[PDB]
């Protein structure tokens, strides 16, 4: 990963250092979400995990909610609600 | 047979618990009873404007700046005029981006914006969890990966769903939208004003059947106008390109109909099967420029 | 089903308050009905 300085391509280096750990390293769609959670970085998760066409598995997403509620990760509760999770089913 | 599925299709909702309504009527219900339902039971007010949205299904990555202007612009026309936006309902294509535009510049102005969904009954994911009489229903907008089916858009307010041959069969909704558009235009816009309710059609990334839908309006009595916007990625941007090179009523400046037919088949592959025919449709659309 | 609850945002609001989780309690309060 190169950080092009001048064309605002792939903006400030923090997103680069962290997004670098998400690309390659295939790992899952899930584990990508879990890693942002431990870091408490929703901007990464929203933009670089909840991408268009991201094929989501089965209630793995629910298992993320269970992890966010314990950890007191409020903004990941908000996000997962917006992106399909149901408290009634959960 | 009895409609047997009418109530509240209240989406699970994300930030909110966005509500909605369903009736599941026939494919032969009369236009008088369709309207009668909307204002009597659902307690809707008569609109001073109708905006029908005909783009396509599966429209897939509207641009960044285009998203801002169309939304900000479309909400304003709707809230400032108390309008009914008519979409297809299915969360694929325009109905996605319309609901996206709502969410951006919401102002919870659903109070003043009554988006209505019209689709066939069967082509919709989780079809079976709605059957019943006056039933509050749950519904999951989970992007079920294996599902090639459609999902109803959470950011809508009403739904009318049209039976047909059966499940899978798609394209038996075109009549009801039109007959309703004729019906609303045959209502006076105010207790004091005699003119009928206007109808206008907006086009986002149209298509080889939409360019027949455009013509079908300009042939209509009265001739319903049409709006298009450039920056799209199918027929709207094309018929936008058709716009700049044409004179009033004229079919062509110095002949480029090979190059036009080249572009006609470039987007949707014809091979001069009927790419010529699509040109004479673009001909009659570049003709009546007093409504484009 | 039956192990579910009809109003889960109520069950979580009580949880967040018994666990002394105010920022979570405020969020869950805004979601659901009967806010007052």
């Amino acid at each position: 990963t190169v950080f092009h300085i001048g064309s605002e391509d792939h903006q400030d280096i923090d997103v680069a250092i962290l997004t670098a750990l998400l690309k390659g390293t295939n790992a899952s769609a899930f584990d990508q979400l879990i890693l942002t959670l431990a870091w408490d970085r929703v901007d990464i998760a929203k933009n670089h995990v909840f991408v268009y066409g991201q094929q989501w598995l089965v209630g793995s997403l629910e298992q993320a909610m269970l992890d966010a509620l314990v950890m007191d990760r409020v903004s990941f509760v908000k996000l997962l609600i917006e992106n399909g999770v149901s408290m009634h089913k959960f | 047979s009895p409609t047997d599925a009418y109530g509240v299709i209240n989406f699970q909702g994300g930030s909110h618990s966005y509500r909605a309504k369903y009736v599941r009527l026939s494919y032969d219900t009369k236009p008088e009873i369709i309207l009668q339902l909307l204002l009597k039971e659902w307690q809707m007010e008569l609109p001073k404007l109708v905006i029908s949205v005909h783009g396509g299904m599966q429209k897939f990555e509207l641009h960044p700046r285009i998203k801002q202007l169309l939304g900000k612009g479309l909400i304003k026309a709707a809230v400032t005029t108390g309008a009914w936006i008519l979409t297809g309902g299915v969360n694929t294509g325009v109905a996605k981006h319309v609901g996206d535009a709502l969410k951006e510049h919401a102002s919870r102005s659903s109070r003043k914006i009554c988006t209505i969904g019209i689709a066939p009954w069967g082509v919709i994911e989780n079809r079976n969890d709605l059957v019943g009489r006056d039933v509050v229903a749950p519904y999951q907008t989970l992007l079920n990966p294996l599902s090639k089916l459609n999902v109803l858009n959470n950011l809508h307010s009403h739904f009318i769903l049209v039976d047909d041959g059966t499940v899978g069969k798609y394209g038996a909704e075109v009549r009801l939208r039109r007959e309703l558009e004729k019906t609303i235009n045959q209502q006076r816009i105010h207790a004091r004003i005699g003119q009928g309710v206007p109808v206008v059609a907006l086009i986002f990334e149209g298509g080889p059947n939409v360019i027949l839908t455009v013509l079908e309006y300009l042939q209509e009595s009265p001739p319903v106008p049409v709006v298009v916007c450039e920056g799209t990625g199918r027929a709207a941007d094309l018929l936008a390109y058709i716009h700049k090179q044409t004179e009033e009523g004229g079919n062509l400046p110095d002949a480029a109909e090979p190059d036009i037919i080249s572009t006609i088949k470039k987007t949707f592959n014809f091979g001069q099967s009927e790419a010529v025919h699509l040109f004479q449709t673009m001909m009659e659309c570049m003709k009546k420029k007093e409504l484009i | 089903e039956t192990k579910r609850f009809p109003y889960p945002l109520n069950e979580l609001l009580i949880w967040a308050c018994l666990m002394k989780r105010q920022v979570m309690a405020r969020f869950l309060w805004q979601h659901g009905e009967e806010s007052m």
Side-chain angles (χ1 to χ4, degrees):
Chain A
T1 301
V2 68
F3 182 75
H4 295 286
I5 295 167
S7 66
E8 62 88 27
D9 191 359
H10 195 189
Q11 187 171 359
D12 58 357
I13 299 94
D14 61 341
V15 176
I17 296 166
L18 301 175
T19 305
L21 295 166
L22 298 173
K23 293 189 289 187
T25 64
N26 54 2
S28 294
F30 179 73
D31 292 330
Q32 294 178 358
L33 191 282
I34 301 299
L35 184 62
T36 62
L37 183 63
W39 294 345
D40 192 358
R41 296 294 301 275
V42 297
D43 56 357
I44 302 300
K46 182 177 74 174
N47 293 318
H48 295 284
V49 177
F50 292 99
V51 297
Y52 181 75
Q54 186 65 47
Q55 185 177 1
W56 291 101
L57 190 56
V58 299
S60 67
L61 290 174
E62 294 181 353
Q63 185 66 39
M65 184 64 75
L66 182 63
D67 303 335
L69 291 171
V70 177
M71 294 174 71
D72 189 75
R73 296 288 187 273
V74 175
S75 297
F76 292 91
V77 175
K78 185 177 179 180
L79 181 63
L80 291 171
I81 293 162
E82 293 176 354
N83 288 315
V85 175
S86 181
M87 296 294 170
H88 299 282
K89 300 297 294 297
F90 178 77
Chain B
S1 69
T3 184
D4 77 11
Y6 64 93
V8 174
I9 191 161
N10 185 2
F11 293 94
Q12 65 185 0
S15 179
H16 296 282
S17 179
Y18 294 102
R19 292 179 184 274
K21 295 181 176 65
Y22 65 97
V23 64
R24 186 180 177 270
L25 59 85
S26 68
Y27 64 92
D28 292 330
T29 303
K30 298 291 180 68
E32 294 178 353
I33 298 168
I34 298 168
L35 182 64
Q36 184 177 1
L37 182 64
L38 295 171
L39 297 170
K40 301 290 182 68
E41 183 64 26
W42 293 354
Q43 296 294 318
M44 294 178 75
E45 292 181 354
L46 191 156
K48 297 178 175 67
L49 180 61
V50 175
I51 297 168
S52 296
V53 176
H54 294 273
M57 288 67 71
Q58 69 265 10
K59 298 290 97 181
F60 293 174
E61 297 292 328
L62 192 151
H63 292 88
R65 180 66 181 272
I66 303 298
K67 183 175 73 174
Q68 184 178 1
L69 296 173
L70 295 172
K72 186 182 286 293
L74 183 63
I75 301 299
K76 185 171 171 68
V79 66
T80 59
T81 61
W84 288 355
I85 298 166
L86 295 174
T87 61
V90 297
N91 203 160
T92 183
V94 296
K96 189 266 187 297
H97 297 285
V98 173
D100 190 359
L102 295 172
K103 182 175 73 175
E104 292 178 355
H105 297 91
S107 179
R108 57 88 175 174
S109 296
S110 67
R111 186 263 181 278
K112 297 293 186 185
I113 299 167
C114 293
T115 62
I116 299 166
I118 298 94
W121 182 258
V123 299
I124 192 71
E125 182 64 26
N126 292 319
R127 187 271 304 278
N128 290 318
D129 66 358
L130 298 173
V131 177
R133 186 178 294 112
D134 192 359
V135 174
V136 176
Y139 182 82
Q140 286 71 240
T141 61
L142 190 281
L143 281 74
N144 199 6
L146 73 165
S147 181
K148 65 182 181 181
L149 278 294
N150 291 313
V151 297
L152 295 173
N153 193 357
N154 54 356
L155 276 296
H156 288 171
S157 66
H158 295 89
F159 293 100
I160 298 92
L161 296 171
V162 177
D163 290 332
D164 59 356
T166 183
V167 64
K169 299 294 187 290
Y170 183 77
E173 70 280 16
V174 176
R175 191 268 300 164
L176 283 77
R177 294 178 69 186
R178 298 295 296 153
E179 294 293 328
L180 183 62
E181 288 171 358
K182 284 87 171 71
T183 303
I184 297 167
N185 196 4
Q186 296 296 110
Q187 297 293 320
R188 64 182 297 163
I189 189 164
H190 184 72
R192 187 171 292 276
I193 298 167
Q195 184 176 0
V197 176
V199 176
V200 63
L202 183 61
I203 305 298
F204 292 166
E205 186 171 2
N209 192 1
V210 177
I211 301 306
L212 189 31
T213 304
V214 175
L215 189 151
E216 192 274 331
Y217 296 167
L218 297 171
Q219 297 295 323
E220 185 59 26
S221 179
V224 175
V226 175
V227 176
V228 298
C229 64
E230 63 87 17
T232 61
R234 199 179 65 181
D237 192 1
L238 280 295
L239 275 293
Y241 182 75
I242 301 298
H243 184 176
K244 276 75 72 171
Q245 58 98 38
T246 302
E247 66 277 17
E248 292 83 2
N251 60 2
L252 56 85
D254 55 354
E257 64 183 1
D259 185 74
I260 297 167
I261 296 165
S262 180
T263 305
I264 293 170
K265 67 180 73 173
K266 189 267 187 296
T267 61
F268 181 78
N269 290 314
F270 293 104
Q272 190 173 356
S273 66
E274 65 277 17
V276 177
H277 182 74
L278 277 296
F279 182 77
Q280 290 91 29
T281 59
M282 292 180 181
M283 183 268 169
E284 296 181 355
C285 293
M286 73 182 81
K287 181 178 88 276
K288 291 179 180 181
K289 298 171 68 64
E290 66 273 17
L291 295 171
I292 301 299
Chain C
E1 194 55 26
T2 64
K3 67 179 73 64
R4 273 69 173 181
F5 295 93
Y7 295 98
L9 277 294
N10 289 322
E11 301 299 330
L12 296 171
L13 190 281
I14 300 299
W15 177 66
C17 294
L18 294 172
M19 296 296 290
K20 185 171 70 65
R21 292 181 183 184
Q22 178 58 245
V23 178
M24 186 65 75
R26 295 292 302 272
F27 181 76
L28 297 170
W29 178 70
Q30 294 178 357
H31 298 283
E33 293 179 354
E34 295 178 350
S35 296
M36 186 177 72

